[PDB]
Design an enzyme around this catalytic site. Structure first.
Site, mmCIF file in Angstrom:
data_model
loop_
_atom_site.group_PDB
_atom_site.id
_atom_site.type_symbol
_atom_site.label_atom_id
_atom_site.label_comp_id
_atom_site.label_asym_id
_atom_site.label_seq_id
_atom_site.Cartn_x
_atom_site.Cartn_y
_atom_site.Cartn_z
ATOM 1 N N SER A 199 1.006 -3.255 -2.039
ATOM 2 C CA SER A 199 -0.468 -4.437 -2.450
ATOM 3 C C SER A 199 -1.575 -4.457 -2.928
ATOM 4 C CB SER A 199 0.169 -5.777 -1.255
ATOM 5 O OG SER A 199 -0.235 -5.618 -0.568
ATOM 6 N N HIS A 223 6.861 -6.672 -4.080
ATOM 7 C CA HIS A 223 6.147 -6.789 -4.716
ATOM 8 C C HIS A 223 6.986 -6.287 -6.142
ATOM 9 C CE1 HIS A 223 2.691 -8.739 -2.861
ATOM 10 N NE2 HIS A 223 3.311 -8.113 -1.654
ATOM 11 N N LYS A 233 7.783 -14.600 -2.882
ATOM 12 C CA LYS A 233 6.936 -13.903 -4.317
ATOM 13 C C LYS A 233 7.785 -14.378 -5.484
ATOM 14 C CE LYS A 233 5.767 -10.374 -1.064
ATOM 15 N NZ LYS A 233 6.769 -10.890 0.087
HETATM 16 C C1 LIG Z 1 5.290 -5.142 1.159
HETATM 17 C C2 LIG Z 1 5.444 -6.539 1.744
HETATM 18 N N1 LIG Z 1 6.681 -6.624 2.469
HETATM 19 C C3 LIG Z 1 7.138 -7.300 3.710
HETATM 20 C C4 LIG Z 1 6.161 -8.628 3.513
HETATM 21 C C5 LIG Z 1 7.176 -10.029 3.718
HETATM 22 O O1 LIG Z 1 7.367 -10.516 3.269
HETATM 23 P P1 LIG Z 1 6.686 -12.729 3.814
HETATM 24 O O2 LIG Z 1 5.771 -12.389 3.525
HETATM 25 O O3 LIG Z 1 7.617 -12.928 2.480
HETATM 26 O O4 LIG Z 1 7.312 -12.656 5.672
HETATM 27 C C6 LIG Z 1 4.554 -8.736 2.592
HETATM 28 C C7 LIG Z 1 4.100 -9.956 2.562
HETATM 29 N N2 LIG Z 1 3.130 -9.963 1.974
HETATM 30 C C8 LIG Z 1 2.359 -11.056 1.776
HETATM 31 C C9 LIG Z 1 2.537 -11.947 2.276
HETATM 32 C C10 LIG Z 1 0.615 -10.129 2.366
HETATM 33 O O5 LIG Z 1 1.098 -9.528 3.154
HETATM 34 O O6 LIG Z 1 -0.372 -10.878 2.717
HETATM 35 C C11 LIG Z 1 4.573 -7.421 1.732
HETATM 36 O O7 LIG Z 1 4.019 -7.523 1.013
#
Ligand SMILES: Cc1ncc(COP(=O)(O)O)c(CN[C@@H](C)C(=O)O)c1O
Ligand SMILES: Cc1ncc(COP(=O)(O)O)c(CN[C@@H](C)C(=O)O)c1O
Lengths: 394, 394
Positions: B184, B212, B243
Site C-alpha cells: 500500500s 489492495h 477496500k
Molecule cells: C495490505 C493490507 N492487509 C490487510 C489490511 C487489514 O484489512 P482491514 O482494514 O479490512 O482490517 C489492510 C488495511 N489497510 C488500511 C486499513 C490501513 O492499513 O490503513 C492492508 O492494507
C-alpha cells in the site's frame, strides 16, 4: 508449495472423526435472525448458545437505525479511523460510551478481539510486565503476545499468586494487570476489590474486559467496575458490541491522555478499517435501549435465576457461575460431543467446551440465557437436556 | 493505578504539537457517505485518501442488499462462526469467493486484519519459519508474531535475500512466505513469479495478502495470483472486504484441508464474533457487480492512468507504483504535515506517510483513485496540490 504444509495439518483428525461419526456441530448454518428460536436445515431450534444477552439483535428500532445509517453513510468507510474512516457517528458513540462507563474518553475498534489487541500490544514494552489471569480470553493472551513486554499468568482469581508475582518484579518497571470481568467459561466474576487493592499497592495499571459484563452487571449494565463501585481504581474498561449490544466492534475507555496515546499507537486501530455505519448506529441505539428500558436486564436475570434454580433442582452439576452463563458439567469429551449433537437433533442449541481447551474431566456444555427467553422455552430445553443426559449415561 | 502508565505515554508529544500548531488532520470526522466528495465541518472536500477503489460503498444495490439482510437476519449473529454465529449467507459468500479466486474453500473473518492473524498464527509453529517481505502490512507482522515460529524479514522484493535466508534453514522444518500482493505505501506489486519459483525449490508455503489487489488486478479483479497466472503456486489467498468490496471483513481461501484446519485452529475466527449480516450481503452484492460490470475496473484504471500522467507532467516525484495508489514524495515530515493540512483546508483529502513509519527523506502523501472519480475532480485536486507545494516550498 504444499509438502511441509500438508505435514503440519496431517495430525488434525478430530473434525474428520466427528463428521464421520455424525457428531459434528460446529459452524451450524442458521437461516434466520439470532433469536430464542433459530432455523437450521428448515427446522426450528431453541437457541441457548448465544451471547445476545438482551435479545436486541431483532429489536426493530435497532434494525431501522442500522438501515437508516446505510441510507445516509453507505456500506463502509473504506479506511482506518486514523485516516479516512472516521464518521461523526463514531465520535458520537465514543462520547456516549465514555459517559456510560464513567471515563474521559473512548476509542472504537472494528471487533472486540482488536479492542484487546490495541492496549495490550502498545502500553507495556521492553522491561515492562503484563499480568494476566490464566483464564483470560484468547484475545487478551494474543494482545499481550503482541507487546514487547514480559507476559506473566497468575492463578485464576488467585490474589496471593497475583501479589507474589508482582512483588518479584523490578520497581523501575511498568506493570499492567488485565482480567476478564465476567469469565465466559464458568461465568464467574473477577475479585476486582482485591485485584485493585494489589494494583494500587504496586502502582500497576488495571484493564478489565467487560465483553460479558456490559448489559449484564453494574448500574444500567455499565459493567464490572460499576458493579463493585471501583470506576476510580480501573484505568481501562474494554468492551465488545457483539454480545448485549447486538452489533460488531468494541471499545476501550479511559483517561483522555491514555486514550489519545492508544488511538495513535495501537496497530489494531491504525491499520484496520473502521466499524461500518450500520454497526455504529445499531450500537448507539442498543446503548440507548439498555439504559432507557430497565426491563431487558431485569428479564435476563429473572430467566437466569429461574433456569439456574431448575437445573440445580434436576441435579445438573453447574460451574461456579455468577452470570447468565450456566456451565453444565459432563466431564467426558466423547459424551460432550454426543450430548451436543443429540440436543441439536432434538431442537436445542448449546455450546460444547472440550479438550484441548479444558481437561476431559472439566468438559461441559454452556447454556446461556437471553432476556427474550420465556420460562416455557427454558422448561422445554431442560426437559430435552434431562432426556439426552439419560440417553448418554452421564 | 496510573503512575508508571503516565510515564510510559509521557514522551508521546507529536499529537499535542500538531494540534497546537493547527496541523492535526487524523481522525477527520466525515458527515456523509464515503464518496469522491465528503462533507467535513459542513464543507465539501475531494476524497483522494480512500481505499474504496471501485466507489461501491454508495451503490444503491449494495445498500439495499445490506438493508434487506438487516430485515431478514437482524443486526448481528452474537457469536463466533465456530459456535452460534454461522449463517447460510456466510457459507454462500465463502463458496462465491472460493470460485472467484479459483480455490477449493474459504473461511471468512470479521476484519481483514484478523484474516492475516488466523493463518500466520496457527500453521507454522515451534521449529518452523515464516518469511515476510520487510514492507508487509502491519497485520502480517502481528499475525506472524502470534505464531510460535521464528519470523524472518527479507529485503523488499529482494528475491536473492529471500533465497539466501531460506537456503540457511534446516531442511526438516516447515516454511511459509507471506507477502502483500500490492504493497500500500508505494503501490508496487510483489515479484510473484520469482517468489513462487523459490518457494517451489524449498517446498515453502505461499500466502498473498490481496487487500489492495482484489477489484484492482487479475481477471475480473481476482487478484495477484490471477494477474500472474500463478493460482497453482499460491497456497493461500487472503483478502479484505473493506477496500474494493465496500464492506468490512476478510477471508482466506485455499485447499479444503488447509482451510478446514484454519477454521478450527485460528484464534481470530474461533474467538471473535462473525461478520454482521449486512456486511455479508454487501460483500456478496459487491462481488457480483465487480464481475458482472467490467466498467468499474476499467474506469479505475482510466483514472489511475490519467492522474499519474498529469502528476508526472506537473513534475511531482512519484513512487514506483503499479496500482491506483500514487505516492507523491515530499521528503520532510514538517512539510508533509503542512501540505496535508493546507490541502484539507482547501478541500482536498490526501493521506500522509511520516516518521517514524518511514524515514523523513521518504515522507510522502498518498493520492488514491476511485472508479467514480471524474477527470474534472482529478484536475481540481492536482491544481490545488501544485499551489500547496508552491506555498510549502517543497
Ligand atoms: C495490505 C493490507 N492487509 C490487510 C489490511 C487489514 O484489512 P482491514 O482494514 O479490512 O482490517 C489492510 C488495511 N489497510 C488500511 C486499513 C490501513 O492499513 O490503513 C492492508 O492494507
Ligand atoms: C471475554 C471476551 N473478550 C473479547 C472477545 C472478542 O470480542 P468479539 O467477538 O466482539 O471480537 C470475546 C468473544 N467471545 C466469543 C466470540 C467467543 O470467544 O466465542 C470474549 O468472550
Amino acid at each position: 508449495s504444499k509438502g511441509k504444509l500438508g505435514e503440519k495439518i496431517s495430525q488434525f483428525k478430530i473434525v474428520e472423526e466427528l463428521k464421520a461419526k455424525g457428531l459434528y456441530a460446529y459452524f451450524r448454518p442458521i437461516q434466520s435472525k439470532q433469536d430464542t428460536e433459530v432455523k437450521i436445515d428448515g427446522r426450528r431450534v431453541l437457541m441457548f448458545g448465544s451471547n445476545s444477552y438482551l435479545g436486541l439483535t431483532t429489536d426493530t428500532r435497532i434494525i431501522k437505525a442500522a438501515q437508516d445509517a446505510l441510507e445516509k453513510y453507505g456500506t463502509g468507510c473504506a479506511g482506518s479511523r486514523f485516516l479516512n474512516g472516521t464518521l461523526d457517528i463514531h465520535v458520537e458513540l465514543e462520547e456516549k460510551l465514555s459517559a456510560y462507563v464513567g471515563k474521559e474518553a473512548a476509542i472504537l475498534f472494528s471487533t472486540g478481539f482488536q479492542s484487546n489487541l490495541g492496549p495490550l500490544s502498545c502500553l507495556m514494552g521492553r522491561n515492562d510486565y503484563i499480568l494476566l489471569d490464566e483464564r483470560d480470553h484468547a484475545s487478551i493472551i494474543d494482545g499481550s503476545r503482541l507487546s514487547f513486554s514480559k507476559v506473566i499468568k497468575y492463578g485464576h482469581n488467585n490474589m496471593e499468586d497475583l501479589r507474589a508475582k508482582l512483588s518479584r518484579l523490578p520497581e523501575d518497571s511498568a506493570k499492567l494487570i488485565c482480567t476478564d470481568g465476567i469469565f465466559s467459561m464458568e461465568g464467574d466474576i473477577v475479585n476486582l476489590p482485591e485485584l485493585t487493592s494489589i494494583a494500587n499497592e504496586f502502582d500497576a495499571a488495571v484493564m478489565v474486559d467487560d465483553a460479558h459484563s456490559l448489559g449484564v452487571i453494574g448500574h444500567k449494565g455499565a459493567g464490572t467496575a460499576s458493579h463493585f463501585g471501583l470506576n476510580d481504581d480501573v484505568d481501562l474498561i474494554m468492551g465488545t458490541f457483539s454480545k448485549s449490544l447486538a452489533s460488531l466492534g468494541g471499545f476501550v475507555a479511559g483517561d483522555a491522555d491514555v486514550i489519545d496515546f492508544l488511538k495513535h499507537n495501537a496497530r489494531s486501530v491504525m491499520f484496520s478499517a473502521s466499524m461500518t455505519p450500520a454497526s455504529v448506529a445499531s450500537t448507539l441505539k442498543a446503548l440507548e435501549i439498555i439504559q432507557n428500558e430497565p426491563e431487558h436486564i431485569e428479564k435476563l436475570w429473572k430467566n437466569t435465576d429461574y433456569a439456574k434454580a431448575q437445573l440445580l433442582d434436576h441435579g445438573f452439576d453447574l460451574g461456579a457461575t455468577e452470570s447468565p452463563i450456566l456451565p453444565i458439567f459432563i466431564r467426558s469429551n466423547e459424551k460432550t460431543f454426543w450430548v451436543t449433537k443429540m440436543l441439536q437433533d432434538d431442537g436445542v442449541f448449546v455450546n460444547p467446551v472440550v479438550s484441548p481447551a479444558v481437561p476431559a474431566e472439566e468438559s461441559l456444555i454452556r447454556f446461556s440465557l437471553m432476556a427474550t427467553h420465556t420460562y416455557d422455552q427454558i422448561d422445554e430445553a431442560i426437559e430435552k437436556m434431562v432426556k439426552v443426559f439419560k440417553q448418554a449415561e452421564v
